[PDB]
């Protein structure tokens, strides 16, 4: 957070 991680 605040950015999110990819799968």
């Amino acid at each position, epitope marked *: *957070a*605040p950015g*999110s*991680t990819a*799968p």
Partner: single-chain antibody
Framework: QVQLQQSDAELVKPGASVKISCKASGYIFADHAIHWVKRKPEQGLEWIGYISPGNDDIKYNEKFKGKATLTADKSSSTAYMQLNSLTSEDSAVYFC??????????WGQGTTLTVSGGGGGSSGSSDVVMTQSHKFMSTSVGDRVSITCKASQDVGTAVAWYQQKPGQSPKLLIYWASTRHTGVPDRFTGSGSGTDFTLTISNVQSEDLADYFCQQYSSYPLTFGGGTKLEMK
């Protein structure tokens, strides 16, 4: 076709445990974390934790460590929250929801827990506090409404706004301080950065009378404002 279907209302004795389920459908279960949120009647939302089933990452709000346990069953695409050692202070509506605020935001319908001193957790002195100055606000149809949220520290632009109507789940309006979520009417705008954030409703309508909540997702634990109930003058 995205769905988060929670289990039925629970009525238990102090000292018991409960396990609330959140069945996910219509997307790849592994590709999004499921968060859990506690709502007490008339009172603010609190973030419990997330489970990220794709990488088995679990993160708790320190306040709920020793009270909540999150698991996920990939075989059933179901997330579970077990609450242990229950007291009246645990009586609330619990939501599961998908992802951080942004395009994948989606909420379960909520599960009411009803439980038939000072053993609950406390917030950290380090946690961000989100202050909505007005718990109640009055307007007239066609007026401009401004709802403000002050953060206790710089949260950059990682702020969201939610609407909630009685018996319904929160609905994302704004994220990244100023970005309107898909489907939200043009009249809802967001502004702000650092410590000051505002949701503006231009040309307000009767369908807009509801509770509004800000949330910061700058840092864990994720924290919500106390809410503003917007009503008719």
């Amino acid at each position: 076709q995205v769905q988060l279907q929670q289990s039925d209302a629970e009525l238990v004795k102090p000292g018991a445990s409960v396990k609330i389920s959140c069945k996910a459908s219509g997307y790849i279960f592994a590709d999004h974390a499921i968060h859990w949120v506690k709502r007490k009647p008339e009172q603010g939302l609190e973030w419990i934790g997330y489970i990220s089933p794709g990488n088995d990452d679990i993160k708790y709000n320190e306040k709920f460590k020793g009270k909540a346990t999150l698991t996920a069953d990939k075989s059933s695409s179901t997330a579970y929250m077990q609450l242990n050692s229950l007291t009246s202070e645990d009586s609330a509506v619990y939501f599961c929801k998908r992802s951080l605020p942004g395009t994948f935001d989606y909420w379960g319908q909520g599960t009411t827990l009803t439980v038939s001193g000072g053993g609950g957790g406390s917030s950290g002195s380090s946690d961000v506090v989100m202050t909505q100055s007005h718990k109640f606000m009055s307007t007239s149809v066609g007026d401009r409404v401004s709802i403000t949220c002050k953060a206790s520290q710089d949260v950059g632009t990682a702020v969201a706004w939610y609407q909630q109507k009685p018996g319904q789940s929160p609905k994302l309006l704004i994220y990244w301080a100023s970005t309107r979520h898909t489907g939200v009417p043009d009249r809802f705008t967001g502004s702000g950065s650092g410590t000051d954030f505002t949701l503006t409703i231009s040309n307000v309508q009767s369908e807009d009378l509801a509770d509004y909540f800000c949330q910061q997702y700058s840092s864990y634990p994720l924290t919500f404002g106390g809410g503003t109930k917007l009503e008719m003058k």
